Each structure stands twice: as structure tokens, then as C-alpha cells.
Amino acid sequence: EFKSIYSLDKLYPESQGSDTAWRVDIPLDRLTISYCRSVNSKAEVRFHLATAEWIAEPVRQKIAITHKNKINRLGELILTSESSRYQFRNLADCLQKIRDMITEASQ
């Protein structure tokens, strides 16, 4: 191959490995997500707050207290919002709304 004078072998002189391209909180198995155009839509995510092992007991109590309106009759906390419907903008401020609720219940 050919290497530039300003090539990445020098432009990123420290990192010569391939794996540093993409090498590496909210659980993926526990929650359930939903999106459906209802034009209009409403995109929601629900999870059993009683079965929430990812939340501390005082944090779970604070979630069950503050988001008691979000706690369903089946004890499932759900959250729905409104911007646009697909992969990256619609599911994960639903996830991040859950995460921010957890963070606010922490303190």
C-alpha cells in the first residue's frame, strides 16, 4: 500500500490497532419498547418496576412513588413521548427518559 505524509499512521500515531475503531447502563432484556403510528404517533417503553433488579430499593420506592402515575395497574412503569418514529430519535430517549427518572430518583 501507500502511506501519506499526513497519513493516519502518524495522524493517530499512538493507536496502530484496528480494534480501537469501536472497542468498548440500561438493560436490554428487561424492558419492552413499542412504536406505532397513530399523521400522529405515541412511542412508549414499559417494564415491570417490581421486577426492576437494576434499580436500588430506595430508588425503586422513589420510582414507584413519583412515577406512580406511570405505574400501571399491573405494576408496570411505562413512558411515552412525541418527536418522530424509527431507530435513534423514538426508542432511546424513551430509554433515556427511564434513565433520567432513575437518576432523579437517586437524588
Binding site: 502511506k3 499526513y6 484496528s18 480501537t20 475503531a21 472497542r23 435513534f88
Partner: protein, 257 residues
Amino acid sequence: ARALDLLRGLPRVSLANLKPNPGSKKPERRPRGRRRGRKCGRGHNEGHSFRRQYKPLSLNRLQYLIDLGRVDPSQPIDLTQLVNGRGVTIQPLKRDYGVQLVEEGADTFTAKVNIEVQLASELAIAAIEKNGGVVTTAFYDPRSLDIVCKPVPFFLRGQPIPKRMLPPEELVPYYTDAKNRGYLADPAKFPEARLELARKYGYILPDITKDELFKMLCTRKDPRQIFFGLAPGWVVNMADKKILKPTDENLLKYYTS
């Protein structure tokens, strides 16, 4: 199909029959006469030019070309691929920028690719990485992009291969940051960005190095090399199917910029 035999029911269609289609041209009225004419037609933006333009590539249409087979995923997805099958066209003129990804609706999109566009959304980066894509953003300078995009003619132009210059100062900080998943940034800073995006996308970032086309995915294009498979300064002898490359030391030095 009664058409051909119904035509066979006449004499030979000679030159005496080729009638203009009724409604071909409205009648050429000489502006006169008792009805049409008695008097005959008289009676008794400051920086719009310095604004950049980047062709927005509909990535749903990229999925179409993936499905329609215009651009196969077996090799890298470059501007060579982006133009070569006529899925979306570029215009070198009008002081343009180049190819940049679009931003709507990545539902039902199952393929593996390695996208190299000038710009894209963070949602587009997560869109590529959701099935595990590769996203890189260098520049494509005006003469450089024009040479790159329609590679057929410059392959027979006769001058030696130019090398792509770096982006201008305004475009420099764009490529300098890995948060754009670009080309001119730190190759280790990209990993924390991928993790943060996978958190922000709620995405399970697979270990793409374990995949079969990981080496195919390992191709991240060298700067100042428009041709993905060829050497800087080269000459495509398209008649003899040869590659004419220089060997002179100062020529190699000015070539190795």
C-alpha cells in the same frame, strides 16, 4: 393481439402514410385574414455562490440499490460505488461539496456496508452501526472530487493521478473530530464514541472484527488517494491494461504528500 393482423388488413405501409400524430403542432396561423388578424399583433443573495452544496444520498435508496443490486455489499461502499451504478448522481459544478448521507426512516434495513460520505447524521452513524456498518468522512476537494466522481474519463485523461488535498480550515475541524465518525481524527477516540452512540442508540454494538468481512470492513480509505485500489501519481494505460507509475525520488516525495 389483433393489432398486427388488423394492420395486415391494409396495403403495404408505404411512405405515403406516415402521418404526424393528430395534435402534433398547433396550426401555424399567418397573423392575418378575416378571423385571426386584422392588425397583426399590435392593435390599432450575497454568499449563495460561496455556499456549499452536498448531494443528499437517500439511505433508503441506498437500501433500494442494495436490494435492487445497483451497489453490491461484497466490496467497499465508496463514491465509486455511489456513482458507478447510477443510483444517485453528483454534480461537480456550482461550487459543490460532495456525497452526504440522508436522515429519514431506517426501519426494515438489513445489510452490511462500509459508508464513506462527506457528512451524515449521528442517527445515520447509528443507522450504519445498527447492523454494523463502517462510517468515515474525509473531504473531496473540487478538482479532486470532480476527478473522483466520474472516474471513467480521468482514467483516460492522460495526466498522472492527482492526490486529494486536505480540507480547508472551516472543513478542517469537522474532519478533526471522531464524533462525526470521520477520517481525519484519532483512531482510538472512535471507540468511546461508538460505545456512547450505542448507549444513545440503545444499540448492541457487535464485535465486527469477529465477522467474516471484518477485513473487508477493515479497509478505511487512505487520505489523498481517490482510487481505493490504485497508487498515487499513477497513470491508467487503458489501452495496454497497464499502470504507469513514476520512480523519481523528488517526484516520489511530492507524490507522497
